[PDB]
Enzyme design. Structure first.
Site, PDB file in Angstrom:
ATOM      1  N   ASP A   1     -14.052 100.408  -0.931  1.00 16.37           N
ATOM      2  CA  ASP A   1     -12.772  99.744  -0.683  1.00 16.37           C
ATOM      3  C   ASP A   1     -12.562  98.619  -1.693  1.00 16.37           C
ATOM      4  O   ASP A   1     -13.078  97.508  -1.508  1.00 16.37           O
ATOM      5  CB  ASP A   1     -12.761  99.175   0.725  1.00 16.37           C
ATOM      6  CG  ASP A   1     -11.462  98.479   1.061  1.00 16.37           C
ATOM      7  OD1 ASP A   1     -10.490  98.644   0.303  1.00 16.37           O
ATOM      8  OD2 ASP A   1     -11.437  97.780   2.092  1.00 16.37           O
TER       9      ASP A   1
ATOM     10  N   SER B   1       2.725  96.206 -12.377  1.00 18.83           N
ATOM     11  CA  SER B   1       3.289  97.411 -12.957  1.00 18.83           C
ATOM     12  C   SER B   1       4.597  97.091 -13.667  1.00 18.83           C
ATOM     13  O   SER B   1       5.328  96.187 -13.280  1.00 18.83           O
ATOM     14  CB  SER B   1       3.528  98.443 -11.847  1.00 18.83           C
ATOM     15  OG  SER B   1       4.209  99.593 -12.316  1.00 18.83           O
TER      16      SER B   1
END
Length: 330
Positions: free
Chosen positions: A35, A199
Site C-alpha cells: 500500500d 498530473s
C-alpha cells in the site's frame, strides 16, 4: 541488494493485489497488500481477536526465534474506506522477493474492522508511503522500504500491476524489459506523507487533451481512480445511460456498455487507461448496473491515482534524497 516478488489480484475485479512476504525465523509466509498510501506493516496474528479472524494466515511471534516485543509500542490506523486495525508491535526479520530487512517493525493486530475480517485473502498490509505517516506510538517506526533503502542497489521500488493478471513489485532496480518507451519522471511533495504529484491533464476516449493540473497521490492500496467532479462528469457523459447514484455510492453504467479509455498526463507524456479497466462489474450479483472505476474525489479531500490508473503503467517510486515518481507505458 534487490528484491522481486509477484503480486496477484485477489479476485476477478482486481479489487486489490497480494504479495507473499516472509516474516520471522523460520519463515512464516503471509500474503500482504502493498500500500503506497500508508506506512504501517501490520498483520493478522496469534493476538488477533479470534472472532475477527476468518481464513487469514496469521503471524505467530512466539514461534519466531528472531521476534522481539517492541516494549510499550502500540499502533492504530484508520483508512480512507472507513476500515481500521490496531494492536502492539514486534521487530522481526522480513523478506520480500529475496530482499531481507532485520529489525523491521511488524505491527500485530489485536483488533481489525469487519472489512478486513471479511476478506480472507489479505493477511495484512505492507505500507510504502513515507515513514512520517507510520502510526506506531510512542516511537514512530520506519517502513520496509525505508529500512531497506541504504542496502538497495538503487533507492527505488517499482509497481507493475496487472490487469486481470499477476504483476511484479521490484526493489532496488528498474527492469528495463518491463515497459515500453521511456519513463517520465515528475516531482513529488512529501508534505502530506504520500507519493503526491501533479498530473498535467486528461482526455476521454479519442477526445482532445485538456491541460489542467490535478494534484493527487499514487496509491496502490486504493482500487479505483478518484478525480475532481468536473473530470469525472466529463468522462461518464460519454457513456450512454451512466449516472451518479447516491444509493449505490458513485457512478454506475449499463453493463452492456463499452467504455471509453481515459488518458492522464505525466509531464508531456500520456498514460492511457483502456476502457475495460474502468469496468468493476455488477453492483450486486446478477445486476445489469455496473460500477464505474473512475469516481469523484469531491468527498475525500484528495485525488487518488489508485490501481485503475497505476496498472496501466510501469511506476517507479524513487526514494532518492529528493523523491520523484516515474511513469512508463507497458
Amino acid at each position: 541488494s534487490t528484491g522481486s516478488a509477484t503480486t496477484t489480484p485477489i479476485d476477478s475485479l482486481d479489487d486489490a493485489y497480494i504479495t507473499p512476504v516472509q516474516i520471522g525465523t523460520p519463515a512464516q509466509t503471509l500474503n500482504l497488500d502493498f500500500d503506497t498510501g500508508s506506512s504501517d506493516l501490520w498483520v493478522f496474528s496469534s493476538e488477533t481477536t479470534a472472532s475477527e479472524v476468518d481464513g487469514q494466515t496469521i503471524y505467530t511471534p512466539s514461534k519466531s526465534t528472531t521476534a522481539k516485543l517492541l516494549s510499550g509500542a502500540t499502533w492504530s490506523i484508520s483508512y480512507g474506506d472507513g476500515s481500521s486495525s490496531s494492536g502492539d508491535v514486534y521487530t522481526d526479520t522480513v523478506s520480500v522477493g529475496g530482499l531481507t530487512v532485520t529489525g523491521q517493525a511488524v505491527e500485530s493486530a489485536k483488533k481489525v474492522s469487519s472489512s478486513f475480517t471479511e476478506d480472507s485473502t489479505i493477511d495484512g498490509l505492507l505500507g510504502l508511503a513515507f515513514s512520517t505517516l507510520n502510526t506506531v506510538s510512542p516511537t514512530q517506526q520506519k517502513t520496509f522500504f525505508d529500512n531497506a533503502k541504504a542496502s538497495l542497489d538503487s533507492p527505488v521500488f517499482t509497481a507493475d500491476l496487472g490487469y486481470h493478471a499477476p504483476g511484479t513489485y521490484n526493489f532496488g532496480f528498474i527492469d528495463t524489459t518491463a515497459y515500453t518507451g521511456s519513463i517520465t519522471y515528475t516531482a513529488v511533495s512529501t508534505k502530506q506523507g504520500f507519493w503526491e504529484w501533479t498530473s498535467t491533464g486528461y482526455a476521454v476516449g479519442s477526445g482532445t487533451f485538456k491541460s489542467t493540473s490535478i494534484d493527487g497521490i499514487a496509491d496502490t492500496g486504493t482500487t479505483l481512480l478518484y478525480l475532481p467532479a468536473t473530470v469525472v462528469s466529463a468522462y461518464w457523459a460519454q457513456v450512454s445511460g451512466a449516472k451518479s447514484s447516491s444509493s449505490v455510492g458513485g457512478y454506475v453504467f449499463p453493463c452492456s456498455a463499452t467504455l471509453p479509455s481515459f488518458t492522464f498526463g505525466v509531464g508531456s507524456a500520456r498514460i492511457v487507461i483502456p476502457g475495460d479497466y474502468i469496468d468493476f462489474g455488477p453492483i450486486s450479483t446478477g445486476s445489469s448496473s455496473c460500477f464505474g472505476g473512475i469516481q469523484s474525489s469531491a468527498g475525500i479531500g484528495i485525488n487518488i491515482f489508485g490501481d485503475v490508473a497505476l496498472k496501466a503503467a510501469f511506476v517507479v517510486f524513487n526514494g532518492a534524497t529528493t523523491p520523484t515518481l516515474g511513469f512508463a507505458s507497458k
